[PDB]
Design an enzyme around this catalytic site. Structure first.
Site, PDB file in Angstrom:
ATOM      1  CG  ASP A   1      -1.787   1.277   1.286  1.00 21.11           C
ATOM      2  OD1 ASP A   1      -2.988   1.184   1.653  1.00 21.11           O
ATOM      3  OD2 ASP A   1      -1.235   2.372   1.005  1.00 21.11           O
TER       4      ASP A   1
ATOM      5  CB  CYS B   1       3.620   4.019   3.256  1.00 23.32           C
ATOM      6  SG  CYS B   1       2.987   2.296   2.979  1.00 23.32           S
TER       7      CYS B   1
ATOM      8  CG  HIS C   1      -0.137  -0.555 -10.668  1.00 21.33           C
ATOM      9  ND1 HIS C   1      -1.034  -1.412 -10.058  1.00 21.33           N
ATOM     10  CD2 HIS C   1      -0.841   0.559 -10.985  1.00 21.33           C
ATOM     11  CE1 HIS C   1      -2.218  -0.830  -9.990  1.00 21.33           C
ATOM     12  NE2 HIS C   1      -2.128   0.366 -10.550  1.00 21.33           N
TER      13      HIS C   1
END
Length: 141
Positions: free
Chosen positions: A37, A40, A133
């Site tokens: 996610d 981070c 991605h």
């Protein structure tokens, strides 16, 4: 088609896998997969500090608190190296970032952020990656 074979998750995987093997063989370190996610590093740090990535919100909150309490200084310079410096000072441990490279000894930290003083505490070590991605490219017109 050379472009395509070169960007194939196949070649990227082989590089990342080689990098894992190297780190292990040359330094004995093991890259541990964090949940995916954001940009981070809070999950990775939480695993480094608490042995548990689900502590990411604790780490994030202290980081934000520490940055804000130190605004004037940090104001001089998302912005991940700012987070990394903050977390090295707040935990008083060095933060080492590792990354695949084809340069000499990829197995050395590409950068080390220092805490306040030197001590015998194990450094915090994280792994920088860029995972393939795909998004959807829409044409309303």
């Amino acid at each position: 088609a050379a472009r395509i074979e070169a960007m194939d998750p196949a070649t990227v995987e082989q590089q990342e896998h080689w990098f894992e093997k190297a780190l292990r063989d040359k330094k004995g370190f093991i890259i541990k997969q964090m949940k995916e996610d954001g940009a981070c590093l809070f999950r990775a740090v939480a695993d480094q500090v608490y042995g548990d990535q689900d502590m990411h919100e604790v780490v994030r909150k202290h980081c934000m608190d520490y940055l804000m309490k130190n605004a004037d200084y940090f104001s001089n310079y998302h912005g991940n190296h700012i987070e990394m410096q903050a977390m090295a000072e707040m935990y008083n441990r060095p933060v080492e970032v590792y990354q695949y490279s084809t340069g000499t000894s990829a197995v050395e930290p590409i950068n080390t952020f220092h805490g306040i003083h030197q001590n015998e505490d194990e450094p915090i070590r994280v792994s920088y990656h860029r995972n393939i991605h795909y998004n959807s490219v829409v044409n309303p017109n």
